[PDB]
Amino acid sequence: GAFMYLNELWKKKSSDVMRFIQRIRSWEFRHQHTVVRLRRPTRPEKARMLGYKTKQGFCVFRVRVRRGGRKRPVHKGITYGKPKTSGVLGMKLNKNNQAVAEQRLGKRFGNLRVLNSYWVNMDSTFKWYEVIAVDPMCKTIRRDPRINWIVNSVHKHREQRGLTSAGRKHRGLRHKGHKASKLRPSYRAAWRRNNRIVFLRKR
Amino acid sequence: SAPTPRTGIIAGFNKGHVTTRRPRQPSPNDRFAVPHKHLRAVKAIIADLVGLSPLEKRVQEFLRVGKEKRALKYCKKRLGDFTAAKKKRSKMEEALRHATK
Amino acid sequence: PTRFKKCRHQRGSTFCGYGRVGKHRKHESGRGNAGGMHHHRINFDKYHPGYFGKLGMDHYHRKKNPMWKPTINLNNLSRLIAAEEAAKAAKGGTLPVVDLQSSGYAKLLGNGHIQVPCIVKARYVSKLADKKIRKAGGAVVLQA
Amino acid sequence: RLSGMNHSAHSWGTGRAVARIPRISGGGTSTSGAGAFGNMCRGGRMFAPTKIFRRWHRKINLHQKRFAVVSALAASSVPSLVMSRGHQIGNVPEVPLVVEDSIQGYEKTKEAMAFLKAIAAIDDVNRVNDSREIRAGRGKMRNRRYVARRGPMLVMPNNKGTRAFRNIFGLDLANVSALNLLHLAPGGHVGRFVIWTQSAFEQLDKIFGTFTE
Amino acid sequence: PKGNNAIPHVHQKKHWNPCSSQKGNVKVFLNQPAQKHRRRRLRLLKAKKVFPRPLKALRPQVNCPTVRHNMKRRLGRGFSPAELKAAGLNPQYAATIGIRVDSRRKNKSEEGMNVNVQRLKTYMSKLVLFPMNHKKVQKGEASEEEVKAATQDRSRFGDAAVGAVVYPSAEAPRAVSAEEKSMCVYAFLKKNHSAVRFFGTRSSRAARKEAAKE
RNA sequence: CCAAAGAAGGUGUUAGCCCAUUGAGCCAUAAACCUGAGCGCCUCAUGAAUAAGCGAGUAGCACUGUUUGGGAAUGCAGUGUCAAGUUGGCAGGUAUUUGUCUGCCAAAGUUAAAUACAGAGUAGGAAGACCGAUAGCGAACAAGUAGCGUGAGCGA
RNA sequence: AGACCUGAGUGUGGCAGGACUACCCGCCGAACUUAAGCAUAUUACUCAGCGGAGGAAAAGAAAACAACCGUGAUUCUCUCAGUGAGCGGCGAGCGAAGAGGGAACGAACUCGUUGCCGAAUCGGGUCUUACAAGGCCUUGAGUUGUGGCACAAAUAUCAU
Ligand SMILES: [K+]
Ligand SMILES: [K+]
Ligand SMILES: [Mg+2]
Ligand SMILES: [Mg+2]
Ligand SMILES: [Mg+2]
Ligand SMILES: [Mg+2]
Ligand SMILES: [Mg+2]
Ligand SMILES: [Mg+2]
Ligand SMILES: [Mg+2]
Ligand SMILES: [Mg+2]
Ligand SMILES: [Mg+2]
Ligand SMILES: [Mg+2]
Ligand SMILES: [Mg+2]
Ligand SMILES: [Mg+2]
Ligand SMILES: [Mg+2]
Ligand SMILES: [Mg+2]
Ligand SMILES: [Mg+2]
Ligand SMILES: [Mg+2]
Ligand SMILES: [Mg+2]
Ligand SMILES: [Mg+2]
Ligand SMILES: [Mg+2]
Ligand SMILES: [Mg+2]
Ligand SMILES: [Mg+2]
Ligand SMILES: [Mg+2]
Ligand SMILES: [Mg+2]
Ligand SMILES: [Mg+2]
Ligand SMILES: [Mg+2]
Ligand SMILES: [Mg+2]
Ligand SMILES: [Mg+2]
Ligand SMILES: [Mg+2]
Ligand SMILES: [Mg+2]
Ligand SMILES: [Mg+2]
Ligand SMILES: [Mg+2]
Ligand SMILES: [Mg+2]
Ligand SMILES: [Mg+2]
Ligand SMILES: [Mg+2]
Ligand SMILES: [Mg+2]
Ligand SMILES: [Mg+2]
Ligand SMILES: [Mg+2]
Ligand SMILES: [Mg+2]
Ligand SMILES: [Mg+2]
Ligand SMILES: [Mg+2]
Ligand SMILES: [Mg+2]
Ligand SMILES: [Mg+2]
Ligand SMILES: [Mg+2]
Ligand SMILES: [Mg+2]
Ligand SMILES: [Mg+2]
Ligand SMILES: [Mg+2]
Ligand SMILES: [Mg+2]
Ligand code: NA
C-alpha cells in the first residue's frame, strides 16, 4: 500500500530531497517552543506503527531536547573523594534523550498518558521527538478495547518509571537470555535475588 | 529431505541415541529467504526519486577511476561491516552498469 | 548452648584468657587474608602452597552438563546387579544386563577383579575394562 | 533494630572531666547530656541485640527419629519404667494395656469416664487432676497459667471415636499412624503409660516392621 | 595465631545485617509452614470451584535435553499442534477441554510424538464432556447418567487418566553373542572418536597432498 | 452433678458446676460475589452445518564514559557514521576473513497467579521457651507531651 | 465573497498539582571502612538526593536455551555454586547462567504492516423504561484513514 512508499522514503534520510526537507523543518523548529502541540503527526506512517490513531483522544506533541553529554552539576567543577569520581565533563547520562523527551512532556501535562514517541529531526544543538499522548477521560478512548488499558491508574506516568519503549531501551530490556540475566526483571530485582542472605528454617 | 540417522554410540560422525528422525517442518519464518519482488520494486522507485546519498556518490566515483579496493575500504569504515560493505559496492557497480545505456 | 562456653568459666577472671600484656585488641594482624605476601607469608607458604599466581588455559562459559562422565569400576559392578540375578549369572550362560547411563554412570573403568559376569551397556569403556570383562565371560555394549 | 539508638548522642571528648561516652544532645531536659548508645547506659542499646535469623529449628536424621520412637515404644511395655516415670499403674490389668475396639462407639463423656475406671486408668487421671495449679514464675503472666501432669495416652486406630474422650482432663489421644515422640517421652523421659486400642495394637507390626521384615 | 586452616572466603562484606543505620538484606523462612498450609487450602478451594474438571490440565511427556539428563522423562509445557492433529483435535478446541497447547515445541522424532499422541487418545477415551444444553444433547457429549457420576482428578500432576511418564523397559538378561566375545569395543569407540577429533587435521593433510599432486 | 462444653477471663484467697465464655441452630439482608457460564421477558449481538508483505537515524560500527563475572569489550549513554531484506537478519561467552550447521525473527502494545512489603496504611484475627516500669517502642501515665533551640531539629 | 492551513479569544464538559512512600519502578549517587600504608579495587551499581505507581509493582508470550533421545512466555524456590566458570594492584576481594526437583498456570492476546473492502468508524442530539456495543438524525470529527475479514492454534467468506 501507500505505507511502503512512505516507509522507504524515510529510509533515505541522507538523500538530496530528504536533507532539504529536514533542513527547512529544522530551521522552523528552532524558532518554536520547547513543547509544541501538533494537529497531525509529521510522520503519520511512523506514528501509526507506534500506536497513534486518527481518533478523538489522541494528541501529538513535538518536544525539543538539547544535545551533548551530561555535565556533572558540581560547584566550580570540584569533586571530592577518590579520583575515580573526579570526572565532570566526560560522564554520560544513563537515560537516552528520547526517554528524557517523553518525561518532560508527561511531567508538564499531567492530564494525559504518554504512549510512545519517535525521532523527527536533528540539528547541531537540538533533537526533536514527537510524543503520542492519550486523554484517559475521552469517551472514545474509554470505549476502545485496543487503547482501553491506558485508562487504568497503573499506567499513570509510565514514562517516569521507564515503561515506554525508550525507557525499556536504556534498561537493557531489548535483550533476553545470557545478554540480560543480571538486569531482568530489573537491575534492582536481580541484585535483591543475588544479595539477600537466605536463612532456611532448618539449615 | 530425511535427516541422516544416528549411530547409537556416544562418539563419531552421527553420534547419538537412535530415534526415527522426522524431516524439518515448514514454518511461517521460511518466507524470510523468499525474494521480495514488490518490496524491491518499491525501493527502486524511491531510489530513482531521491538520487544518491553522499556515501553513494563517493563510492561511485571510486569505481569510475578504477579504485575498487579503495571503495571497499571506504564502505567498510562507514558501514562497519564487511558483508554490508560488499553489498553497497555491488549495488553501485550495478548502478554504474545500468547508466551506460 | 551458652552455659557450656568458655565465657561462663571466665566470669571473675577479668582478662578472659587473652592476657594482661598482649590484651584483646580489634585487628592486630589486619582483616581477613591481609598480608598474604607481607607478614603472613610463612603461614601461606607452608600451609597453602600454590595459592598465588596463574596457571592453565581459560574456559569461558563452562557447562558441567556436557562434561558429565561418572565412572564405575569392574569390581563394583555388583552394586548395580540385583541379588537374585547375580547368583544365576555364570560364564557361558544367561547374564544380567546393566544400563550404566540409567544408573548414573557413563564410563566403565576396570579396576580390580570382576565378581559377577554380566553385559554392561556403557557410553565409554577403558581399554583394560573391555579386555577384562570379555575374558571373564561378559561383554560391553555401547550406548548413547 | 533501632531500640536504644534513636538519638544523636555524640561523645563530648577528653577536655571535659567526664567519661568518653556518647551523650544525648540538646538541653532543657533531664535526659540532655545523659549517657547514650551504650549497653551500660540507661536507655541505651543492649549488648548484641537479638535477631530473628537465630537458628530456632533443628534437623534430625530421619532414621534417628524413627529409632527414638521405637525406643520409646519398647520402654512403654516395661512396667518398672512406666512406674519410674511417675504413672500410677498399680491397678491396671496388663502392660501393654490393650482394650477392645468398642470404645470408639462412645458418645458421652460419662461412658468414657466409666471405661477409664474399669481398666483402672482413672488413678493416673486422678493424679493429673490433683496436680493442677498456677504455674510458678513469669510464665503465668504469659499464656501458660496452669500446669499439670501428663497422664495416660489412649491410642486409637484412626481419627474416629474420640468424641467422648476430648473433655476428659488428664487423658491424651493419639493416632497409631502418627505417633509423636514428644508425647511418648515427655520431658525426654521414656515410659509413658499407653492404653492401646486393639485395632491400633494390631497395626504396630506393619507400621514399624520387624527385625527381619 | 592463625595455624593450619582453610583460607576463608565467607563474603558477607556488604550491609546485609539489619541494625541501626542499615535496613539489611535478609530473607528468613519463618512463614514456610503457614504458606504451605495456605497453598494446600487454595488448591482444595480451587478444585471445588472448577469441579468436576481436573485441577491440573493435561501435559505431554518430553525428554530432558542435556546428555546428562537425556535418559530422563518429564512433563512438558503443552501438546504440539502436530500431536493434536494426529489425535484428531483442533488445538483451539483442545484448550477448552483441559489440554495444554504449546506451538513452540517441535517434533524431531517419531517416538517422542507417538507417546504424546497416545496420551491424548487415552485422555479423549476417558473424557466426559458435559453438554451446553442438557435438554438438547449434541454428538460427542455425555448423557445425564455420566454427568451425575463425574469425579474430580485432583492429582498433583493431573495424570490419573494417562498415568505417569513412561520410561523405557529394562533389557532382560540374555547370553553373550559370538561377535561380542571377540570384538574389541574400546578400539571401535576410540576409532570413531578419533575420526571426529582429528577430522580437521586429517582433511588438511589430504587437501595439502592434492596440492603436491599438481 | 455436667461434659460433643476441663477454655486460659471475671468475681473480696487456688472455681468445670457464682458470672461471662465454649455448640447445634434461628432471624434479618443496598449493590457486588457464587450457583445447568443460576432462572424468565423485551431488545441487541453471535456460532455451527492468491499472491504479497511483517516495525530505520533502528540495528550495527568508531571514539569516549559508565556498568557487568562477561574476559580483543555484558548492557547502556553521548557524538560521529549509519544498513540488510535476490536462501535476508540476529544469537550460538578469543578478535579476523571465509563456508557449513543449529535456534530464533529485534527496533509497536496489553496480560492473572505463584514473589516483596527490610521504619507504610484500613478492617479484623491468632500467637510467643521474648521484656517486665533504669527492662520492653522515646512514650504501660493529658508523649512526640512538658521543656530546650532564631532555626533545621532535640526531647524527658 | 468564500475556502482550508496555521494560530488565537471566549462559553460548555472534564483532567493535573498535594498527601503517602515499608515493599516496587526510573534517574542521580558518597564517604567512612577493607586492602594492616594508598591511588585501581572494596564498601556499592549501597546511604543521602530527585521523580512515579499499585495492592503489589516490575517482568512476560522467544531476533530464548542448548548442541540433547532435545527443551519451550514471565515470576519465584531448592540446587547449580562461594564455583578445577570467570573478574581482580590475579592482591584484598568479587562472582553468575543453562540443565534438574518444584510453586503457579483454563494463558494467552492487540496494533502496525501485506492482501481484499472501504466511513460499514467516532463523537453529539433524539427515541425505545436505556448518557443501550440498539434505531433514526447529524458536517461536527475523520479519506494526511476510522473500522471489517484473513495471516501456521491458519487454510476461504457472504449472503439465505
Ligand atoms: K581484608
Ligand atoms: K559496584
Ligand atoms: Mg566523590
Ligand atoms: Mg532466573
Ligand atoms: Mg538463589
Ligand atoms: Mg550473595
Ligand atoms: Mg575483680
Ligand atoms: Mg589465672
Ligand atoms: Mg586463650
Ligand atoms: Mg596478641
Ligand atoms: Mg608487647
Ligand atoms: Mg615489603
Ligand atoms: Mg600466562
Ligand atoms: Mg532500651
Ligand atoms: Mg498443690
Ligand atoms: Mg519468682
Ligand atoms: Mg475443645
Ligand atoms: Mg604459639
Ligand atoms: Mg606468636
Ligand atoms: Mg585447624
Ligand atoms: Mg541511627
Ligand atoms: Mg448451558
Ligand atoms: Mg478461674
Ligand atoms: Mg459458638
Ligand atoms: Mg445459563
Ligand atoms: Mg519484525
Ligand atoms: Mg543509531
Ligand atoms: Mg564496578
Ligand atoms: Mg565496556
Ligand atoms: Mg564502551
Ligand atoms: Mg508491561
Ligand atoms: Mg502456637
Ligand atoms: Mg523508676
Ligand atoms: Mg521506659
Ligand atoms: Mg525513656
Ligand atoms: Mg561501616
Ligand atoms: Mg587502609
Ligand atoms: Mg589500620
Ligand atoms: Mg587512611
Ligand atoms: Mg534512598
Ligand atoms: Mg499476588
Ligand atoms: Mg503490571
Ligand atoms: Mg522458560
Ligand atoms: Mg559443592
Ligand atoms: Mg560488586
Ligand atoms: Mg524446571
Ligand atoms: Mg527452576
Ligand atoms: Mg444513539
Ligand atoms: Mg487500520
Ligand atoms: Na441475595
Inter-chain Cβ pairs, chain B and chain C, closer than 8 A? 20
Contact C65/E71, CB-based, under 8 Å?
A: no
Q: Is the minimum CB–CB distance between D2 and chain E shorter than 8 Å?
A: yes
How many Å from the CA of D185 to C1' of F24?
A: 38
The nearest CA of chain B is from the CA of A2 a distance in Å of 10
Give A147's Cβ-side CA count (13 Å radius): 27
Q: Which helix (H) or strand (E) holds C88?
A: helix C83-88
What whole-number distance in Å separates Cα of residue A63 and Cα of residue A109? Answer: 12
What residue in B sits closest to C121 (Cα-Cα)? B9
Contact A196/E32, CB-based, under 8 Å?
A: no
- The dihedral through the CA atoms of C85, C87, C88, C94 has a sign that is positive
Which of chain A's residues have a Cβ under 8 Å away from the Cβ of B53?
12, 14-15
Q: Find the angle CA(A13)-CA(A16)-CA(A22) to the nearest 5 degrees.
A: 55
As given in the structure block, the three cell numbers for residue E112 are 517422542
As given in the structure block, the three cell numbers for residue B50 are 531521491
What whole-number distance in Å separates Cα of residue D210 and Cα of residue D213? Answer: 5
Q: Which helix (H) or strand (E) holds E61?
A: strand E61-63
With contact defined as beta carbons under 8 Å apart, do A117 and A101 qualify? Answer: yes
Tell me which DSSP letter residue C93 carries: S
Closest to D77 (Cα-Cα) out of D193, D208, D210 = D193
Q: Which helix (H) or strand (E) holds B59?
A: helix B54-64
Of the candidates E20, E24, E28, the beta carbon closest to that of D2 is on: E20
Contact D1/E20, CB-based, under 8 Å?
A: yes
Residue ranges near ligand 20 (ion) with Cβ within 5 Å? E 5
Neighbours of chain D (3+ CB pairs under 8 A): A, E
Which of chain E's residues have a Cβ under 8 Å away from the Cβ of D2?
20
Q: Are strands A58-66 and A126-134 parallel, antiparallel or unpaired?
A: antiparallel
Contact D53/A199, CB-based, under 8 Å?
A: yes
What whole-number distance in Å separates Cα of residue C24 and Cα of residue B29? Answer: 73
Q: What share of chain A is helix, strand, coil (3-state, %, to 5)?
A: 40, 15, 40
What whole-number distance in Å separates Cα of residue B23 and Cα of residue E106? Answer: 11
What whole-number distance in Å separates Cα of residue A35 and Cα of residue A157? Answer: 18
Residue A100 neighbours by CB under 8 Å, 6+ apart: A65, A93
What whole-number distance in Å separates Cα of residue D104 and Cα of residue D163? Answer: 8
Which of chain B's residues have a Cβ under 8 Å away from the Cβ of C143?
8-10, 17
What whole-number distance in Å separates Cα of residue A40 and Cα of residue C95? Answer: 85
* Residue of D52, D55, D65 to mutate, interface with A, max A Cβ within 10 Å: D55
Contact D56/A203, CB-based, under 8 Å?
A: no
Which of chain C's residues have a Cβ under 8 Å away from the Cβ of E173?
85, 88-89, 94-97
Q: Are strands C71-72 and C107-108 parallel, antiparallel or unpaired?
A: parallel
With contact defined as beta carbons under 8 Å apart, do A17 and B51 qualify? Answer: yes
How many Å from the CA of A40 to C1' of F51?
A: 34
Q: Which residue has the cell 481436573?
A: E54
User: Residue type for E40, please?
Assistant: R
Tell me which DSSP letter residue D178 carries: B
As given in the structure block, the three cell numbers for residue A66 are 538539547
Experimental approach taken: cryo-EM
Establish whether A42 is an annotated binding residue. no
With contact defined as beta carbons under 8 Å apart, do A62 and A43 qualify? Answer: no
Q: Is there contact between A107 and strand G, defined as CB under 7 Å from any strand atom?
A: yes
Tell me which DSSP letter residue D191 carries: -
The backbone torsions φ and ψ at residue D99, rounded to the nearest 5 degrees and listed phi first, read -125, 165
As given in the structure block, the three cell numbers for residue C64 are 558441567
CB atoms within 10 A of CB D111: 13
- The alpha carbon of E7 and the centre of ligand 10 are apart by a number of angstroms equal to 20
What whole-number distance in Å separates Cα of residue B63 and Cα of residue D14? Answer: 87
Distances (CA, A) of C4 to C10, C134, E15: 11, 62, 31
The backbone torsions φ and ψ at residue A133, rounded to the nearest 5 degrees and listed phi first, read -125, 155
The nearest CA of chain C is from the CA of B23 a distance in Å of 22
As given in the structure block, the three cell numbers for residue C126 are 577403558
- The dihedral through the CA atoms of C73, C76, C80, C82 has a sign that is positive
Tell me which DSSP letter residue C80 carries: G
Kindly report which amino acid residue has its CA closest to the C1' atom of nucleotide G46: E15
- Residues 5..34 of A with a Cβ closer than 8 Å to B: which? 5, 8-9, 11-12, 14-18
As given in the structure block, the three cell numbers for residue A147 are 487503547
With contact defined as beta carbons under 8 Å apart, do B92 and B64 qualify? Answer: no
Q: Is the minimum CB–CB distance between A4 and chain B shorter than 8 Å?
A: yes
How many Å from the CA of D39 to C1' of F143?
A: 25
Which of chain B's residues have a Cβ under 8 Å away from the Cβ of E106?
25
User: Residue type for C21, please?
Assistant: V
CB atoms within 10 A of CB D124: 26
Closest to D131 (Cα-Cα) out of D146, D149, D153 = D149
- The alpha carbon of A187 and the centre of ligand 45 are apart by a number of angstroms equal to 13
Inter-chain Cβ pairs, chain A and chain D, closer than 8 A? 9
Maximum pairwise Cα distance, chain A: 73
Q: Are strands D153-156 and D194-197 parallel, antiparallel or unpaired?
A: parallel
Residues β-bridged to residue D153 = D172, D194
With contact defined as beta carbons under 8 Å apart, do A166 and A91 qualify? Answer: no
Q: Is the peptide bond before E168 cis (omega within 30 degrees of 0)?
A: no
* Residue of E25, E30, E31 to mutate, interface with A, max A Cβ within 10 Å: E25
DSSP state string for D196-211: EEHHHHHTHHHHH--S
Q: Is the minimum CB–CB distance between C83 and chain B shorter than 8 Å?
A: no
How many Å from the CA of D147 to C1' of F1?
A: 25
With contact defined as beta carbons under 8 Å apart, do B85 and B75 qualify? Answer: yes
Q: Is the minimum CB–CB distance between B15 and chain C shorter than 8 Å?
A: yes
Contact B17/C142, CB-based, under 8 Å?
A: no
- The alpha carbon of C27 and the centre of ligand 10 are apart by a number of angstroms equal to 10
The nearest CA of chain A is from the CA of E111 a distance in Å of 30
Nucleotide nearest to A191 (CA to C1'): G45
- Residues 30..89 of B with a Cβ closer than 8 Å to A: which? 38-39, 42-43, 45-47, 49-55
Residue ranges near ligand 6 (ion) with Cβ within 5 Å? A 195
Kindly report which amino acid residue has its CA closest to the C1' atom of nucleotide F90: A175
What whole-number distance in Å separates Cα of residue E10 and Cα of residue E8? Answer: 6
H helices of E50-151, in order, are: 81-86, 91-94, 110-126, 144-148
Return chain C residues 76..105 having CB < 7 Å to nucleic acid strand G: 101
DSSP state string for E24-44: --EEE-TTHHHHHHHHHHHHH
Closest to A16 (Cα-Cα) out of B42, B71, B47 = B47
Which of chain B's residues have a Cβ under 8 Å away from the Cβ of A16?
50-51
Give D199's Cβ-side CA count (13 Å radius): 12
With contact defined as beta carbons under 8 Å apart, do D33 and D44 qualify? Answer: no
Residue C81 neighbours by CB under 8 Å, 6+ apart: C89, C96, C98, C116, C118
Establish whether A34 is an annotated binding residue. no
What separation, in Å, do the N-terminal and C-terminal C-alpha atoms of chain E show?
76
- Residues 4..33 of B with a Cβ closer than 8 Å to A: which? none
Which of chain C's residues have a Cβ under 8 Å away from the Cβ of E176?
95, 119, 137-139
Three-state DSSP class for residue C132? helix
Q: Is there contact between A25 and strand G, defined as CB under 7 Å from any strand atom?
A: no
3-state secondary structure D86-123: CCCCCCCCCCCEEECHHHHHCCCHHHHHHHHHHCCCHH
Q: Is the minimum CB–CB distance between E138 and chain C shorter than 8 Å?
A: no
Neighbours of chain B (3+ CB pairs under 8 A): A, C, E
As given in the structure block, the three cell numbers for residue E114 are 507417538
As given in the structure block, the three cell numbers for residue B63 are 569505481
Residue E60 neighbours by CB under 8 Å, 6+ apart: E75, E76, E78, E79, E80, E83, E100, E102, E105, E116, E119
